[PDB]
Amino acid sequence: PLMVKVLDAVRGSPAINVAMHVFRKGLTTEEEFVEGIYKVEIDTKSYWKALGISPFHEHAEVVFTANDSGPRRYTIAALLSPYSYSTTAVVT
Amino acid sequence: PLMVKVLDAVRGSPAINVAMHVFRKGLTTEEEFVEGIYKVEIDTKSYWKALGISPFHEHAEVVFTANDSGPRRYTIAALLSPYSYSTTAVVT
Amino acid sequence: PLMVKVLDAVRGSPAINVAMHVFRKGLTTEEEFVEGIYKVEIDTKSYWKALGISPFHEHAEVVFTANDSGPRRYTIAALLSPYSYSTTAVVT
Amino acid sequence: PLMVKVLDAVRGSPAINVAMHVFRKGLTTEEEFVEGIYKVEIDTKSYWKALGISPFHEHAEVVFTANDSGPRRYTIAALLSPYSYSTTAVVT
Amino acid sequence: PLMVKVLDAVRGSPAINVAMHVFRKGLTTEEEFVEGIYKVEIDTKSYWKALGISPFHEHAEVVFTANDSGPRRYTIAALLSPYSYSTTAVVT
Amino acid sequence: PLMVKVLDAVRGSPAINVAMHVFRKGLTTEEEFVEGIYKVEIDTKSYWKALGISPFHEHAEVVFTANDSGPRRYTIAALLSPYSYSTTAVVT
Amino acid sequence: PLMVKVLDAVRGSPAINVAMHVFRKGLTTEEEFVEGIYKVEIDTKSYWKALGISPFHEHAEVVFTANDSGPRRYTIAALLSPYSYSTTAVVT
Amino acid sequence: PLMVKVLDAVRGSPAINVAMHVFRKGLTTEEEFVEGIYKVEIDTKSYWKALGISPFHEHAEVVFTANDSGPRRYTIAALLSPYSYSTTAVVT
Amino acid sequence: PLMVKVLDAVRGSPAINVAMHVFRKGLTTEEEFVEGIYKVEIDTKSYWKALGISPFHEHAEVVFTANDSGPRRYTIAALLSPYSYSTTAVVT
Amino acid sequence: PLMVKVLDAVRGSPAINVAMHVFRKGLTTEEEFVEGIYKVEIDTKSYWKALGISPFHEHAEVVFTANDSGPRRYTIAALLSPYSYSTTAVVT
Amino acid sequence: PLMVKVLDAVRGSPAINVAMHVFRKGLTTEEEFVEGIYKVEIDTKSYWKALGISPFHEHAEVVFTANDSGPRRYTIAALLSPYSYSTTAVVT
């Protein structure tokens, strides 16, 4: 007789992020899983992933170069941070 | 007799994000999963993924170059952050 | 006798995002899954994906170059962030 | 006797996004799935995907160049963020 | 005896987006699936997809160049964000 | 008779992030796992991952160079930090 | 008769991050695990991971160089630190 | 009859981080574990990890060089340190 | 009849980090553990880890050099140190 | 009838870090352990760890050099030291 | 009938670090242990650890040199030392 009670009585004006999971009971294999529920990804980089079976098997001559140079500005305010009765100013 | 009770009584004006999962019970394989419910992806990069079976198997001469240069500005305010009785100001 | 009760009584004017899953029970393989429920993708890049079976199998001479330069401005305010009794100003 | 009760009584003027899934029970394979319920895509790029079986199998000489330069401005306000009794102002 | 109850009593003037799923039970294959329910695509780009079986099989000499330059302005306000008793101004 | 009671009575306007998990009971294999519930990734880099079975098996001559140079500015304020009756100010 | 009681009565406006896990009971193998619930990653780098089975098996001549140079500024304030009745200023 | 009582009565406006785990009962193998719940990663580097089975097995001539030079500034204030009635000021 | 009572009555505005574990009862093997839940890692470096089984087994000629030079400044204030009624100033 | 009572009555505004573990009852093997509850890592270095089984087994000629030179400044104030009614000042 | 009572009544604003463990009852083997509860590691170095079984077994010619030179400044104040009604200045 499992019972879960969440934010039953809310009197007011909150700022809320609620993540709940209820569970009652082949290069890359993933099964029965929970991933990136509130995941935030900024300027992520993946070059070579899961190329495959027997790639470049014989007499491969590869030249791999990755140049991550760049003038980049992101400037996030209040990332994944709920706020209440509050002021968020991004001024440039 | 599983029972889940969430935000049953809300008196007021909140700012809410609610993610709830209730569960009662081949190069890339993924099964019976939940992913990227609130996934936020900004300027993500994937170059080579799952090319396949026996790619470049024999006598391959590849030249892989990735130039991630660039003048880029993102400037997000209140990302994935619910707010109440609040000010979100982006000024440039 | 599974029972789920969410936001049963709402008195007021909230700002709400509600994501709720109730579950009772070959280069890429994907089964019985839930993906990108509230997914946000901004300036995402995928160059080579799942090329296939035996691509460039013999005597391939490839020249792969990716130039991610560029003057780009995004400037999002209140991304995936419900707000109430609130002011969102984007001024340039 | 599964039972789901959502937003049963709403007294007021909320701003609501509701996604609910209730479930009772060959290069790319996807089965019995839910994708992009509230998915948001901005300036996404996919160059080469699922080219096929035995592409460029023998003596291929490819020149792949991708130039993602460009003067681009997006300027979204209140993306996927319901708001109530609120101001959303985009001024340029 | 599955039962789903949503927004049974609404007293007021809300702004609502309602997605509800009730489920009781070939290079690219998708089966019994749900996709792009509220998916939003802006300036998305797909160059080469599912070219086919044995394309460029022998002695192919391809020159692939993609120039994503361009003066482009999008300027969306209140994307996928229902609002109530609210003001949305896009001024240029 | 498991019972979980969280934030049952909330009188006021808090700023809350709630992650709650209730559980009652092949190069890379991941199963029965929960990951990235609130995980945030900024400027993460993965070059070569899960290349495959027997890659570069015989007489491979690879040149791997990764240049992570670049003028980059991130400038996040209030990352994953809910705030109440508060000011979040990013000035440049 | 396990019972868990968390933040039962909250009178006021706190800033809260709460993570709770309830549990009642082949190169890389991880199963039945809960990882990176509130994990934050900034400028992380992984070059070669899980290359595969018998890579560079015979007569490999690799040149691996990683240059992590770069003018980079991050400047985070209030990372994973909820604050209340407080002032967060990032000034440059 | 295990019972856990945490922060039952909170009168005021604290700044709180709460992690609670309640438990009642092959190169890399990890089982039934909880890892990096509130882990913070800044400028972490992993070069070669889990290359695989029999890599560089015979007559390998590798040149591994890692140059971690770089002008980098991080400048975090209030990392994983909730604060109340407080000032967090980053001035440059 | 195990019973745990923590911070039952909190009158005021403290700054709190709460980590509580309640427990009632193959190169690398890791079982039934909790590791680095609130561990924070800054500028950590791991070069070669778990290369694999029989790497460089015969007639290997490796040149391993690691140059950890670099102009780097971190400048953290109030790391993992909650503060109350307090002022945190980082001035450069 | 084990009973644990911690910080039952807190009247005031303290700064608190709380770690409590309550417990009632193959190169690297670790079982049923707790690690890095408040673990802090700064500029840690691990070069060669768990290379594997029979690495460099026969006729290996390795040249291992590690140069930990570098202009590096860390300058942490109030590390893992909660403070109340206090000033934390980093001036350069 | 074991009973533990800690900081039952706290009237004031102390600065507290609380670590309590309550316990009622193959190259490297580690069992049922507790490590690095408040561990702080600064500029720690581990070069060769657990290389493996029979490494450099026959006719190995290794050259191991470790140069720990470097201009490095750490300058921590109030490390793992909670303070109350106190002033912390780090001035350079």
Residue numbers in the entry:
A (entry chain G), B (entry chain H), C (entry chain I), D (entry chain J), E (entry chain K), F (entry chain F), ...: 11 to 35, 57 to 123
Quote the study's own text.
Systemic amyloidosis of the ATTR (amyloid fibril protein derived from transthyretin) type is a potentially life-threatening disease that is caused by the misfolding of the circulating blood protein transthyretin (TTR). TTR is a naturally tetrameric protein with a very high β-sheet content. One TTR chain consists of 127 amino acids and the native tetramer acts as a transporter of thyroxin hormone or retinol-binding protein in the blood. Well over 120 mutational variants of TTR are known to give rise to hereditary ATTR amyloidosis with Val30Met being a particular important one.
ATTR amyloid fibrils were isolated from the hearts of two patients with type A Val30Met ATTR amyloid fibrils. A three-dimensional (3D) map reconstructed based on the cryo-EM images achieved a spatial resolution of 2.97 Å based on the 0.143 Fourier shell correlation (FSC) criterion. The fibril is polar, possesses C1 symmetry and consists of a single, twisted protofilament. The larger density segment fits with residues Gly57-Thr123 of TTR, the smaller density with residues Pro11-Lys35. Weak density occurs adjacent to these ordered regions, suggesting that residues Gly1-Cys10, Ala36-His56 and Asn124-Glu127 are structurally disordered or absent. The fibril cross-section shows a relatively compact protein fold that resembles the shape of a spearhead. There is an internal cavity that is lined with polar and ionic residues and probably water-filled. Stacking up the fibril proteins along the fibril z-axis generates the cross-β-sheets. All cross-β-sheets have parallel strand–strand contacts. In the N-terminal arch, an extensive hydrophobic core is formed by two leucine, one proline, one isoleucine and five valine residues as well as the variant position 30. The fibril protein fold differs profoundly from the native conformation of TTR-Val30Met, which contains nine β-strands per protomer along with a single α-helix.
